[PDB]
Design a protein around this ligand. Structure first.
Ligand SMILES: NC(=O)c1ccc[n+]([C@@H]2O[C@H](COP(=O)([O-])OP(=O)(O)OC[C@H]3O[C@@H](n4cnc5c(N)ncnc54)[C@H](O)[C@@H]3O)[C@@H](O)[C@H]2O)c1
Ligand SMILES: NC(=O)c1ccc[n+]([C@@H]2O[C@H](COP(=O)([O-])OP(=O)(O)OC[C@H]3O[C@@H](n4cnc5c(N)ncnc54)[C@H](O)[C@@H]3O)[C@@H](O)[C@H]2O)c1
Lengths: 493, 495
C-alpha cells in the first residue's frame, strides 16, 4: 500500500500487491478460499519469499506452489509461473468483462452501422456473470438493448448495480419502449423477465426483427444452466433434482426453437452471432443442420482486431490513487483519437466503471501502440507525474486448420521472458477426450528507471508482434499486410 | 545440404554457426530437423544473416519470425508439436541427436549403478542374463561388457544376432545353450568381459536354465513383451511359424504369447529367489504376467525406481557435448579433463576410457556422460577456458536432449534456461485427443571461449540440474532433499 515498498525492489512489491489485490473483498468471489495460490501455506510462503527475493533472483511457482528460487540476473523475470488444470495475478474485477463486451459490439458497429449502435436494437438473453455486461456494452456504444432473462433477481442485481436502466414483465411493453429509444436514437437497456425459448419465437411471429442479435444464456449447460420453455424457476428445479433425463431433453428442445427464431431473424436481415455459449452445437445435435448459418463473435469480430495485433492491454496503479489512472486516461485521448471507439471507451469508463481494489484501466491497443504508451507511462513515473509504479499486463476456427497448435503461447512466454517481462505465466490443461489448451500471460512493471524502459520497449513490441505473425502465418491478409506495413521480420515472407 | 565445417564461421556469430552445424549434423547419413526442404533453406539463410542481438523462432520446424532481443538471450527458440488426430490413435529435437552413443551409455549407466549397489563397483566376475537384441536391447551386451561383466543374451532372430556381431555390439554367438553356458562361466571364472548371443526363445530357455540349476548374478529382459501380437514370439514357434499364425489367427497367437510371458516371468522369479539381482527394463513384462495370474510378478523392481531415479535425485543426468571443429581430438582432450577433474567417480572414468576404444563417432565427434549438480558448471567453465586458449580448435556445443501438472516442470525448465542465456531452447508438445498429451523441453549452450558465454554457462548449467533435484525433493525423495540442503538449493517450502 502507498508510495513506498517493503520488498527489495518494485517488481517484487508489484507481485505482492497484485497477489493481495486478487483476494480484495471487492475484487474476489470467495477470498477466504480461492485460486491465487495452491493453498494458504503456499500463499504465505509466496508472500514471505517475495519480501526477501533479491533483484537478481527468480521465484518459480509450480501450480500455485513456490517450489524454488534460482540466481538469474536483474533483467530476468522475478517470477515464472506454470500452473496446470488460476493466478497470473492481474485480475481487475468486472472491468475486464465490461470492456471486452464493449469491444465486440464496437466492431459490430464499425462493420455494419457506421461505427455506432445509435438507432439500433440489440436483442439478446442471459444477464448472468458475463451476460450482465451486455446491456452496458450496448448502451456505451449508443444502442438500445433488450435483454431477455428468466430470473427476476438477476435483472434486479443488474438494475441495483447500474448495469441495466429498466425492466418489464410485458413483452409488448418492452417492445414499445425499445422502438421509442431506437426512433429517438437514445441509448437505453431494458431487461424483460421471460424465457428466451418462449419470447424470441413470439417476436418472429409478431413481425419484430432486431438490428443486432446474440445470446448469453447458459446453453453450454443444459441441466444446471438453461431453463427450458414452459417451466418456472421452482418447477424447473424440482424436475432437475428428480428427472434430469427429461430436463436436458426439454432444455435441448427449448434451445432448438430459440436458435430457429435466431435463424429466422437472421433471414429478415439481423446481424446475428454466437457468443461462446455453445448454442449452435446443442441445436444441431437436437436436429437443425442450419444452426451454424450465423458465425461466432471471435471469427466474426475479434480475430480481425488480433490480425492488426490489437489486444487487451491493462494497467494498474500500485499507489492505490485513482488520479494515477485519470492521468494515464488523458494520454490515451491525446494520442489514439484516430481510434474513436477507444476514446469513447475511456470517457464512458470514467463515468460508468467504478474501481475495485487497486485502480486499473483496460482497453485494446495494437502493434506499435502498446510500446508507445508503455514508454510515456514509464517517463511519468520517473518525473513523479504518477505517484508510484504501474503494473502493465496482458492475461477457434483458424483459416488453415491450426486451432490446436500449442507452439504459439509457448514461444510467446519464452520470448516475453527473454525480453525482461517482470513475470510470465503459462496455464496448461486437458487430456484424453476433451483436448488441450495452453495460454501465456505477461506482466511488466513501469517503475520509472532506464532499465525498465529497455524491457518495456522489448516486451511491448514482441507480445503484439507474435500475435500478428501467428495470424499472418495462418494466411490472414490483414495480418500479412500489418506485418509488412509495420516491419515485422518473417523469414518465409 | 550446404556444408558448414572446420575452424572458421560463415555466420555473424558462433551460436548461429553452431545452430547451422547441429541442424546439418541431424541430417547426417552415419547419424526431421525442419518442416520441409523449403523451411530448411529459410532456417539456414536466416541463421547466416541473424545478428547477435536477434532471436529466430521455429514453430514445428518452420522459421516464422526474427525479433530484436539482446546478446545474452538464446539466438533460437524452438516450439514443436506432433499431434496425432483422434482417428489416427489406434495406429498404435533440440538438434542434438549424436547417434547410438546415447542408448549405449544410458544402458551402461543402468548396469554401472547395479554394479555400485550390488557387486562392489564392477561387473567383472558376474554373468548377466537378458533377452532381446533389438533397437534398444542390442546395447545391453556392450553396456555389460564395458562394465567388466559377462553377458549372455537370448534372441529368437539369428540374423539379428549376426548383425550385432558384424557391427561390434556383440563378441560371439551360438545356437547351443550348453556352449553359451560353458563360455559364460569360463569368462566369469577368469573375470574376463565377454558378450554371447544365444539363438533361442527366452520363454523356453529360462525355464530350462532354472531346471538345470544355473543362476545368473544379474537378470533382466528387453524382449518386446509390450506387444504380444507383433513383438513377443511365443514358445514353440519359429519366426516363420510365428508370422503365419500372427496373420491367420491373432487370438491364438496372443494367448500363446501372454502364456509364454507368464512362463518367462515365473522363471525370473525362480532365479531371483535363488539370488539373481533381477529387474524390469521398461518392456511391460511384469504387468502382462500379473494379468495372466502370476500374483508375485511385481516382486522384482523396475530399473528406474531401483537404479536411475536415485541418480536424478542427486541431479545427475545425461550431459552431452559436441566438437564443432569436427576434430575427434577436441573430444579426447575434454575426456582427459573428465579423467583429471572427476577421478573420484570410477564408473564415469571407466566409461570415458572404454568409450574411446568401443564407441565410434557418428557425424560430429560427441561425448555423453552423466554429471550432476555442481559438476556440470565446473566442466562447462574448463571447456570454455580451453576454447578461449585455443586448446580446442572451435567452440563446443553442450546440450541436454528432451528425454496435467507433470507438464509444469518442462515449461519452467525451458523458461529458466532461456532467461539464464541458453544458446537455444526447445519445447516439444506430443500426443492427441484419445491418448493424452506430453511436454518435453531441451536446451543447448555454446562454450565459445568468451566472458559473456562463461556467465551464461554458470547460470544455465546450475539451473538445469537444480530443477530436477527440486522436483524430486518436492515429491518427497530423501536423497533429493539431502542434495538440496547440502548444495544450498533455495526451496521455500522445504522443512
Ligand atoms: N467466450 C467469451 O468471451 C464469452 C463471453 C461472455 C459469455 N460467454 C458465454 O455465455 C454463457 C453465459 O455466461 P455467464 O457467465 O453469464 O453464465 P451464467 O450462468 O452466470 O448466466 C446465464 C444466465 O442465463 C439465464 N437463463 C437460463 N435460461 C434462460 C432462458 N431460457 N432464457 C433467458 N435466460 C436464461 C440464467 O438465469 C442466467 O442469469 C457462457 O456459456 C459463457 O461461456 C462467453
Ligand atoms: N523405458 C526405457 O528406458 C527402455 C529402455 C530400453 C528398452 N525398453 C523396452 O524394452 C523393449 C525392447 O525395446 P526394443 O526397441 O529393443 O524392441 P525391439 O522390437 O527392437 O526388440 C525386441 C527383441 O525381442 C526379440 N524377441 C521377441 N520375443 C522373444 C523371445 N520370446 N525370446 C527372445 N527374444 C525375443 C525380438 O526378436 C527383438 O529383437 C521395449 O518394450 C522397450 O519399451 C525400455
Amino acid at each position: 500500500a502507498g508510495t513506498e515498498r517493503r520488498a527489495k525492489g518494485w517488481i517484487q512489491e508489484a507481485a505482492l500487491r497484485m497477489l493481495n489485490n486478487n483476494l480484495h473483498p471487492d475484487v474476489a468471489e470467495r477470498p477466504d478460499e480461492l485460486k491465487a495460490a495452491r493453498n494458504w501455506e503456499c500463499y504465505e510462503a509466496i508472500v514471505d519469499t517475495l519480501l526477501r527475493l533479491e533483484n537478481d533472483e527468480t521465484l518459480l511457482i509450480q501450480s500455485g506452489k513456490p517450489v524454488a528460487v534460482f540466481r538469474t540476473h536483474p533483467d530476468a523475470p522475478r517470477v515464472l509461473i506454470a500452473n496446470s488444470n488460476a493466478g497470473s495475478w492481474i485480475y481487475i474485477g468486472s472491468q475486464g468483462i465490461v470492456q471486452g463486451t464493449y469491444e465486440t459490439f464496437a466492431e459490430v458497429a464499425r462493420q455494419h452501422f457506421g461505427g455506432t449502435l445509435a438507432g439500433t436494437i440489440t436483442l439478446t438473453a442471459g444477464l448472468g456473470g458475463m451476460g450482465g455486461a451486455q446491456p452496458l456494452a450496448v448502451t456505451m456504444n449508443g444502442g438500445v438493448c433488450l435483454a431477455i432473462e428468466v430470473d427476476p433477481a438477476r435483472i434486479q442485481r443488474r438494475i441495483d448495480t447500474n448495469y441495466l436502466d429498466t425492466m418489464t414483465d410485458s413483452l409488448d411493453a418492452a417492445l414499445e419502449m425499445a422502438k421509442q429509444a431506437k426512433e429517438e436514437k437514445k441509448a437505453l437497456s431494458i431487461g424483460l423477465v421471460g424465457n428466451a425459448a418462449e419470447v424470441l419465437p413470439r417476436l418472429v411471429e409478431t413481425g419484430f426483427v432486431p438490428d443486432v442479435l446474440t445470446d448469453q444464456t447458459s446453453a453450454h449447460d443444459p441441466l444446471n444452466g438453461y431453463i427450458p420453455a414452459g417451466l418456472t424457476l421452482d418447477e424447473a428445479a424440482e424436475l432437475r433434482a428428480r428427472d434430469p433425463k427429461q430436463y436436458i431433453a426439454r432444455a435441448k428442445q427449448s434451445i432448438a426453437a430459440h436458435v430457429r427464431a435466431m435463424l429466422a431473424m437472421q433471414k429478415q436481415g439481423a446481424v446475428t452471432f454466437d457468443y461462446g455459449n455453445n448454442i449452435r452445437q446443442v441445436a444441431k445435435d437436437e436436429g437443425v443442420d442450419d444452426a451454424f448459418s450465423f458465425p461466432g463473435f471471435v471469427p466474426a469480430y475479434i480475430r480481425p482486431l488480433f490480425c492488426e495485433g490489437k489486444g487487451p492491454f491493462r494497467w494498474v496503479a500500485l499507489s492505490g490513487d485513482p488520479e494515477d489512472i485519470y492521468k494515464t486516461d488523458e494520454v490515451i485521448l491525446r494520442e489514439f483519437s484516430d481510434n474513436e471507439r477507444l476514446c469513447h471507451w475511456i470517457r464512458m469508463a470514467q463515468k460508468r466503471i467504478k474501481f475495485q481494489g487497486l485502480p486499473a484501466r483496460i482497453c485494446w491497443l495494437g502493434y506499435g501502440e502498446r510500446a508507445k504508451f508503455g514508454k510515456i507511462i514509464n517517463d511519468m513515473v520517473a518525473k513523479g507525474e504518477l505517484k508510484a509504479p504501474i503494473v502493465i499486463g496482458r492475461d477457434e476456427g483458424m483459416k488453415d486448420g491450426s486451432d490446436a497448435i500449442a507452439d504459439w503461447p509457448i514461444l510467446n512466454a519464452l520470448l516475453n521472458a527473454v525480453g525482461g517481462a517482470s513475470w510470465v505465466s503459462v496455464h496448461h490443461g486437458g487430456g484424453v477426450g476433451m483436448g488441450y489448451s495452453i495460454h501465456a500471460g505477461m506482466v511488466i512493471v513501469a517503475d520509472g528507471t532506464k532499465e525498465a524502459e529497455k524491457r518495456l520497449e522489448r516486451v511491448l513490441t514482441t507480445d503484439p508482434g507474435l500475435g500478428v505473425i501467428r495470424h499472418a502465418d495462418a494466411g490472414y491478409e490483414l495480418a500479412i499486410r500489418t506485418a509488412k506495413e509495420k516491419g515485422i521480420d518473417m523469414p518465409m515472407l
